[PDB]
Design an enzyme around this catalytic site. Sequence first.
Site, short mmCIF file in Angstrom:
data_model
loop_
_atom_site.label_atom_id
_atom_site.label_comp_id
_atom_site.label_asym_id
_atom_site.label_seq_id
_atom_site.Cartn_x
_atom_site.Cartn_y
_atom_site.Cartn_z
N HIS B 102 0.92 -1.25 0.03
CA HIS B 102 0.18 0.06 -0.03
C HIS B 102 0.58 1.53 0.04
O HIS B 102 0.32 2.43 -0.15
CB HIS B 102 -1.02 0.18 1.22
N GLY B 103 2.07 1.32 0.25
CA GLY B 103 2.88 2.34 0.19
C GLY B 103 2.63 3.43 -0.93
O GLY B 103 2.72 4.76 -0.71
#
Lengths: 168, 167
Positions: B102-103
């Site tokens: 999800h970065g």
Amino acid sequence: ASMKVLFLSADGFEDLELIYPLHRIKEEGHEVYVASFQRGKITGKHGYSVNVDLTFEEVDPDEFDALVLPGGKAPEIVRLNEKAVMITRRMFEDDKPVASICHGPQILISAKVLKGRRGTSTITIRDDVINAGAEWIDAEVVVDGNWVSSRHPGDLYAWMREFVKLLH
Amino acid sequence: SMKVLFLSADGFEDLELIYPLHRIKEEGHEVYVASFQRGKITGKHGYSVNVDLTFEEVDPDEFDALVLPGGKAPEIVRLNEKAVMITRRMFEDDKPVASICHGPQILISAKVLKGRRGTSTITIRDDVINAGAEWIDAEVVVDGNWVSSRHPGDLYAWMREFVKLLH
């Protein structure tokens, strides 16, 4: 040269201590294998899963070039498996690179290979490492010929920094 | 020796923050964990890491490279104007930026992805595409300064490529 590196573990392993060296060693192009009591998966203290490639009975120690012994609760049951301990003794006595962290040395203790050696472990088993005939050192990493040892997950960077140097 | 900044918060995917911290330190680089407040942050699976500085304390010009781990943390980090500013500046300055899982939600919010190429967890593929990037399903993608992977299974490849960018 490229190596085949064997990892001995079981349910209850310290997640980081198994999973970090698996990936770090694979990065180098080495092949990594996890042996445990049964095929399938094993699950860490913190819930991460790892697939098992072969069982302790299936392992031919002569087929592997290096050994990694992560910690957690797993070494206390792995050290009761006579095959796992025989594998460890054989590989260690053949002077193949062996890496241990945290409780991993309980398997080395059971393998009766520590007399006159030098390394570390979680300090909570310092006295047992000493009773196995080794000199216990409180350091992030200790290198004693083929035996590279660390204490806990804070040491991961230093542990594999030193261990990868033996894997060629 | 570079100074590598990590942006994270409570709810981080434990391996995705802790693996690169150690892997990068192994190389002799200095690693810094930045979050909302000083103290500690705790991962989804319960591992804790100390916070070295707050987002408001970070001057991006003092850092050489950026790491954006995943888990739940990006969704709250992307709400912090300063964290988003740090990432926009470092990314546009063409400094190495590593993202996983999800970065890239932070990269989306930094508005730096138009015409870029990379990966993330497939569960936000459509959001990465909507941000103007080409989304690729691969264990690691290298797009100039931007090294991206999907999930913990990709860690070995992810840092293999990122370490090269650092030297």
